[PDB]
Design a protein around this motif. Structure first.
Motif, PDB file in Angstrom:
ATOM      1  N   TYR A  82      19.985  -1.366 -59.140  1.00  0.00           N
ATOM      2  CA  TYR A  82      18.646  -0.803 -59.075  1.00  0.00           C
ATOM      3  C   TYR A  82      18.738   0.674 -58.728  1.00  0.00           C
ATOM      4  O   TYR A  82      19.573   1.075 -57.916  1.00  0.00           O
ATOM      5  N   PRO A  84      15.741   3.762 -57.960  1.00  0.00           N
ATOM      6  CA  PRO A  84      14.318   4.129 -57.971  1.00  0.00           C
ATOM      7  C   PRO A  84      13.967   5.251 -58.928  1.00  0.00           C
ATOM      8  O   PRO A  84      12.870   5.241 -59.495  1.00  0.00           O
ATOM      9  N   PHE A 196      12.358  -6.125 -49.734  1.00  0.00           N
ATOM     10  CA  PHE A 196      11.699  -5.275 -50.721  1.00  0.00           C
ATOM     11  C   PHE A 196      12.545  -5.140 -51.982  1.00  0.00           C
ATOM     12  O   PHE A 196      12.047  -5.303 -53.102  1.00  0.00           O
ATOM     13  N   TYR A 197      13.837  -4.858 -51.818  1.00  0.00           N
ATOM     14  CA  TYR A 197      14.672  -4.682 -53.002  1.00  0.00           C
ATOM     15  C   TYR A 197      14.927  -5.998 -53.728  1.00  0.00           C
ATOM     16  O   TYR A 197      15.043  -6.002 -54.955  1.00  0.00           O
ATOM     17  N   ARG A 200      11.910  -6.436 -55.838  1.00  0.00           N
ATOM     18  CA  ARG A 200      11.982  -5.602 -57.039  1.00  0.00           C
ATOM     19  C   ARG A 200      12.961  -6.171 -58.056  1.00  0.00           C
ATOM     20  O   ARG A 200      12.674  -6.181 -59.258  1.00  0.00           O
TER      21      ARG A 200
ATOM     22  N   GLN B   4       4.349   0.421 -48.904  1.00  0.00           N
ATOM     23  CA  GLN B   4       5.403   0.325 -49.912  1.00  0.00           C
ATOM     24  C   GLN B   4       4.760   0.237 -51.290  1.00  0.00           C
ATOM     25  O   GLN B   4       4.562  -0.835 -51.858  1.00  0.00           O
ATOM     26  N   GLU B   6       5.908   2.464 -53.882  1.00  0.00           N
ATOM     27  CA  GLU B   6       6.773   3.322 -54.672  1.00  0.00           C
ATOM     28  C   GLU B   6       7.913   2.491 -55.254  1.00  0.00           C
ATOM     29  O   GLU B   6       8.037   1.292 -54.989  1.00  0.00           O
ATOM     30  N   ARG B   7       8.743   3.141 -56.070  1.00  0.00           N
ATOM     31  CA  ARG B   7       9.973   2.517 -56.546  1.00  0.00           C
ATOM     32  C   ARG B   7      10.975   2.325 -55.418  1.00  0.00           C
ATOM     33  O   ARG B   7      11.703   1.329 -55.390  1.00  0.00           O
ATOM     34  N   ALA B   8      11.046   3.276 -54.496  1.00  0.00           N
ATOM     35  CA  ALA B   8      12.006   3.238 -53.405  1.00  0.00           C
ATOM     36  C   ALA B   8      11.333   2.787 -52.116  1.00  0.00           C
ATOM     37  O   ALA B   8      10.144   3.016 -51.902  1.00  0.00           O
ATOM     38  N   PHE B   9      12.115   2.139 -51.259  1.00  0.00           N
ATOM     39  CA  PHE B   9      11.600   1.673 -49.980  1.00  0.00           C
ATOM     40  C   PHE B   9      11.270   2.857 -49.082  1.00  0.00           C
ATOM     41  O   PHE B   9      12.078   3.774 -48.922  1.00  0.00           O
ATOM     42  N   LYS B  11      10.853   4.558 -45.675  1.00  0.00           N
ATOM     43  CA  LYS B  11      11.369   4.410 -44.326  1.00  0.00           C
ATOM     44  C   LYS B  11      11.534   5.785 -43.703  1.00  0.00           C
ATOM     45  O   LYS B  11      11.684   6.785 -44.404  1.00  0.00           O
ATOM     46  N   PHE B  16      16.625   3.089 -36.927  1.00  0.00           N
ATOM     47  CA  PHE B  16      17.133   1.764 -37.254  1.00  0.00           C
ATOM     48  C   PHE B  16      16.433   0.706 -36.413  1.00  0.00           C
ATOM     49  O   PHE B  16      16.465   0.763 -35.179  1.00  0.00           O
ATOM     50  N   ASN B  18      16.718  -3.121 -35.514  1.00  0.00           N
ATOM     51  CA  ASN B  18      17.724  -4.170 -35.606  1.00  0.00           C
ATOM     52  C   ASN B  18      17.047  -5.521 -35.808  1.00  0.00           C
ATOM     53  O   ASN B  18      16.170  -5.892 -35.025  1.00  0.00           O
ATOM     54  N   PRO B  19      17.405  -6.261 -36.840  1.00  0.00           N
ATOM     55  CA  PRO B  19      16.776  -7.567 -37.062  1.00  0.00           C
ATOM     56  C   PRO B  19      17.442  -8.686 -36.278  1.00  0.00           C
ATOM     57  O   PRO B  19      17.229  -9.865 -36.574  1.00  0.00           O
ATOM     58  N   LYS B  20      18.249  -8.336 -35.276  1.00  0.00           N
ATOM     59  CA  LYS B  20      19.073  -9.317 -34.580  1.00  0.00           C
ATOM     60  C   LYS B  20      18.980  -9.277 -33.060  1.00  0.00           C
ATOM     61  O   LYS B  20      19.317 -10.283 -32.422  1.00  0.00           O
TER      62      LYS B  20
END
Lengths: 203, 141, 226, 260
Positions: A82, A84, A196-197, A200, B4, B6-9, B11, B16, B18-20
């Motif tokens: 991918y 963008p 998100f990716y 997509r 969100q 757009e084509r790109a995320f 951020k 950062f 952390n999801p943990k």
RNA sequence: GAAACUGCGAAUGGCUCAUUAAAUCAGUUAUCGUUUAUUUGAUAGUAUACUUGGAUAACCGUGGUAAUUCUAGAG
RNA sequence: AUUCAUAAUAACUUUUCGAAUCGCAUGGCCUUGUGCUGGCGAUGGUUCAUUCAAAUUUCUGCCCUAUCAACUUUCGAUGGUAGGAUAGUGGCCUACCAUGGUUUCAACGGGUAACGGGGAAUAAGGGUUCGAUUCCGGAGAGGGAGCCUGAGAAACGGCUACC
């Protein structure tokens, strides 16, 4: 050659400007690198100030970071999935910043297996489960058993990242600028960015 | 008005989440104080929009000239043009003539702007072909 | 065409004017670098083998390696290319050069003898010329005389003899990379300076640490008073 | 245009050098160094136009090639070395020491100093931050960097630099009541005492000053130079005039008092 | 103390006013938006060695072109 | 005022550099070995600071002309996101997206026998006119364009091509 001057543009009123001087060397541009995945081929560019850039023409491997675990490994880029800015870059496998790639998950698997003493993938394959079961119980001393036991609890990873490990290819995003630094580095996609990716990619 | 889109995320770079670690499952958000006596709007601190050109939740700094003017167009995305009326002195006639300038300024999602409003803008680095100023204060008009 | 024939082994050179086209027909369609036998060229050249090394055409333009042509081409020459000596740093010129393929349009054809077949030659094979200078770097002298890393190289240096009226004398090359007490003195001095510098830096850091500690503890008691 | 300039037109030279109009087309272009081109005093000017020792530039080069001239304790062979404020000039062969200090007139006056005072110099602190390996340093107004400075030294403070070792002897805090000298603007060279510092964030800081004769005059913070702890007690020797401004009538009266 | 290799300078200066009408320029700003030879200060003990190679110029010699601040073989 | 200075962890790199250089003097130690030591300088070299500079840049200010009223957006015009390129910001360029941007407070177009300023003449005051030209800034080297080298040039008493 390629020029970055703004005098060749129209005014904000739409007026046509007249030429004020010839093109200057301190306002040049150069050709894009268009980095591809292949055997390493890095060229050097002498820049302003006698400085030096590296234009990655082809690169095989990169330095990739696992952010939630704080470890980075040198792994292999498998391809681009991918981009963008332009899908033609995906189609031709062009590596730039922000491109989403697949990298080999092997070094990260070794690190995690050695560090938490577990397995990733949840694939009870014919020959896969043999490896998984063997990794479950190996030849291992006692203080190391205890350190691994203390390291458990902080051992499960999120499901979306875990499900990828059964393929050996983890999704990632390039963070370096290969045409400038000559290197193709990045980080593992996790969290809502990964979600998100994936959304997509499934289109 | 989803973030969100757009084509790109979208951020904030190098913030950062952390999801943990443990719970408080919301993304951490960075913001700054622009200084010079301007307050950070509440939408910048507890908001969710991503805007690298925002003075508060973005990487652009305010330095140089501080201007004020009337908003005359809000028809661009995240950019406005403001009108600066003034009086030019002509010494020969000991009099004045009415003059104006149009200035394009970035407007952060933390603010709400409508045509006919007075805004204060601070100077930033070039962030567009015509934009060098960024909204810091909106006065209803 | 003339034949600039040279003999590297003895350092002899002499040009031979062969006006007969059929004799030098074995040279045609050959390249610089390629080697040829001289049985067809003339009669005294029986058994000789020559290497074609270049030449100049009827207009004087030199032959250049890599130009796959029997004809003249026009090239942008820079630092390093043969047939061009740059006059300013970074300067390039576009110059006319002759290709590396030998044809009949050549005024001369430079040749180097590769092997001496059966007879001799008038001023090439039967004579020798000495080298002009001997070794000057220390290990070049040692490898020239097979000397081991113990012999004083100073006493085996070639010394040309120069006469002036009657007070004849010798000129000897100065030797580079020769170890003396001065060179070892400098090697000692550099390391001594580095170590001394490291000592002074450590002392400065230690003094700063002591100052920081004094301020820290006096601050502790000063805020413990209030 | 294509690169740095190397000549200096005579009419473009700084006005405090007192260069005549008609001696030639050019003026000495001060070299790169510890002081700004516009706020320096090249040594050729000091030894030719001020001391009158040399008759011409070629004699200035004859003098300086023989190690005679020193600035801040170091021999300089640069005919155009950018000597500036507080710089100590030493002439050993004549056993004579000088300090470049502004006079009330706005010029680098010729100031003879003793040998004991010709062993240090003051320096205004421009900034402090940590360098490589976490080591802090300060920068003075002459491009000097000193590692491991006192934790209390901040911007606009003045440090007393020992010339032999380049180390900080002692420093003066910037606060109300400090003896200062003005190093720029209209009030160049005048010595006063700090009365009130006025702050303007993002803009310019103004400093109200007062002379020994009670006249208050304000100046940009950038032009201030802390030179003493209190009134009347500087850490360096002052030029003949004590840094006091006189009206034109007053100077006329004093000239006619010493010449009539 | 010639020649030549290496280093630096040759981007300063001097000349002219053709182009150029928000362009140049003037006074004011900004670089928390960058490059910077040189000068001046600082600044590095890092986890075969009583010192490594092999070219090349100058030089000798053979020269080609009507002709150039052309240069080619070879030592 | 900062995601600044700085420090830390994990790795990365066609692995940057932490002296195979030069000149003067040559002294000191005795466990006398062609031992160990060491004075004044030259030239170097990493990073930061500084200086000499560059490059972009905010605000406001130009002569005549409507027998120039609409201009810009095909092929960047105004803005957004991502990238590429640059020493670096920026439609500077590319991809995708939105439909914007300037204008009777004169845009846009046309003319200038226009390089700009510091300044000059005249001068009650207010004004009128001049300033190619001793200083400052810009631009050019017959006309265009493209480059090498170099810290720095789109250099012309440098190269390449065309006229």
């Amino acid at each position: 050659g390629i020029s970055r001057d703004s005098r060749h543009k129209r005014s904000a009123t739409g007026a046509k400007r007249a030429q004020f001087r010839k093109k200057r060397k301190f306002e040049l541009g150069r050709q894009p690198a268009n980095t591809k995945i292949g055997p390493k081929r890095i060229h050097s560019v002498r820049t302003r100030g006698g400085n030096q850039k590296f234009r990655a023409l082809r690169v095989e491997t990169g330095n990739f970071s696992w952010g939630s675990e704080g470890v980075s490994r040198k792994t292999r880029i498998a391809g681009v999935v991918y981009h963008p800015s332009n899908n033609e870059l995906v189609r031709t496998n062009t590596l730039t910043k922000s491109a989403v790639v697949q990298i080999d998950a092997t070094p990260f698997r070794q690190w995690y297996e050695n560090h938490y003493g577990a397995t990733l993938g949840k694939k009870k394959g014919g020959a896969h489960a043999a490896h998984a079961a063997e990794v479950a119980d190996a030849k291992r001393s006692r203080k190391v058993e205890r350190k691994l036991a203390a390291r458990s609890g902080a051992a499960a990873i999120e499901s979306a990242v875990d499900s990828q490990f059964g393929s050996g290819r983890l999704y990632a995003v390039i963070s370096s600028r290969p045409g400038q630094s000559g290197r193709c580095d990045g980080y593992i996609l996790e969290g809502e960015e990964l979600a998100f990716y994936l959304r997509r990619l499934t289109a | 008005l989803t973030v969100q889109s757009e084509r790109a995320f979208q951020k904030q770079p190098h913030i950062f989440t952390n999801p943990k670690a443990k719970a408080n499952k919301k993304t951490k958000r960075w913001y700054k104080d622009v200084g010079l006596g301007f307050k950070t709007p509440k939408a910048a601190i507890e908001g969710s929009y991503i805007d690298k050109k925002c003075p508060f939740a973005g990487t652009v700094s305010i330095r140089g000239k501080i201007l004020t003017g009337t908003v005359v167009s809000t028809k661009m995305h995240r950019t406005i043009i403001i009108r600066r009326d003034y009086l030019h002195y002509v010494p020969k006639y000991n009099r004045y003539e009415k003059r104006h300038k149009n200035v394009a300024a970035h407007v952060s999602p933390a603010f709400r702007v409508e045509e006919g409003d007075v805004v204060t803008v601070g100077q930033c680095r070039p962030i567009s072909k015509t934009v060098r100023f960024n909204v810091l204060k909106v006065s209803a008009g | 065409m003339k034949l600039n024939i040279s003999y590297p082994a003895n350092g002899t050179q002499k040009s031979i004017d062969i006006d007969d086209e059929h004799k030098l027909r074995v040279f045609y369609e050959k390249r610089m670098g390629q080697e040829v036998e001289g049985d067809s060229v003339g009669d005294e050249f029986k058994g000789y083998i020559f290497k074609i090394t270049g030449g100049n055409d009827k207009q004087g333009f030199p032959m250049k390696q890599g130009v796959m042509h029997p004809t003249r081409v026009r090239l942008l020459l820079s630092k390093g290319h043969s047939c061009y000596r740059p006059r300013r740093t970074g300067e390039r010129k576009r110059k006319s050069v002759r290709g590396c393929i030998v044809a009949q349009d050549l005024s001369v054809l430079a040749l180097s003898i590769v092997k001496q077949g059966d007879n001799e030659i008038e001023g090439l094979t039967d004579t020798t010329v000495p080298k002009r200078l001997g070794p000057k770097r220390a290990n070049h002298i040692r490898k020239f005389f097979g000397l081991t890393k113990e012999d004083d190289v100073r006493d085996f240096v070639v010394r040309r003899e120069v006469t002036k009226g009657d007070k004849t004398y010798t000129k000897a090359p100065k030797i580079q990379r020769l170890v003396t007490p001065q060179t070892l003195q400098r090697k000692r001095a550099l390391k001594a300076k580095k170590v001394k510098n490291a000592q002074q830096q450590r002392d400065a850091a230690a003094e700063y640490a002591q100052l920081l500690a004094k301020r820290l503890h006096e601050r502790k008691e000063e805020r413990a008073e209030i | 245009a294509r690169g740095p300039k190397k000549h200096l037109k005579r009419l473009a030279a700084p006005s405090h050098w007192m260069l005549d109009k008609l001696s030639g087309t050019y003026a000495p272009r001060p070299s790169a160094g510890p002081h700004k081109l516009r706020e320096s005093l090249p040594l050729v000017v000091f030894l030719r136009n001020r001391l009158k020792y040399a008759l011409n530039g070629r004699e200035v080069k004859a003098i300086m090639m023989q190690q005679h001239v020193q600035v801040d304790g170091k021999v300089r062979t640069d005919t155009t070395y950018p000597a500036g404020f507080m710089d100590v000039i030493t002439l050993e062969a004549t056993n004579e020491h000088f300090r470049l200090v502004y006079d009330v007139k706005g010029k680098f006056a010729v100031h003879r100093i003793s040998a004991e005072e010709a062993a240090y110099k003051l320096g205004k602190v421009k900034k402090v931050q940590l360098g490589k390996k976490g080591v802090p340093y300060v920068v003075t107004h002459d491009g000097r960097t000193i590692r491991y400075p006192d934790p209390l030294i901040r911007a606009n403070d003045t440090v007393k630099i020992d010339l032999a070792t380049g180390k900080i002897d002692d420093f003066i805090k910037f606060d109300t009541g400090r003896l200062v000298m003005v190093t720029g603007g209209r009030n160049l060279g005048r010595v006063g005492v700090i009365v009130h510092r006025e702050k303007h964030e993002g803009g310019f800081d103004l400093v109200h000053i007062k002379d020994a004769l009670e006249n208050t005059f304000v100046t940009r913070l950038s032009n201030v130079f802390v030179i003493g702890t209190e009134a009347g007690k500087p850490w360096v020797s002052l030029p003949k005039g004590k840094g006091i401004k006189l009206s034109i009538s007053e100077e006329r009266d004093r000239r006619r008092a010493q010449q009539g």
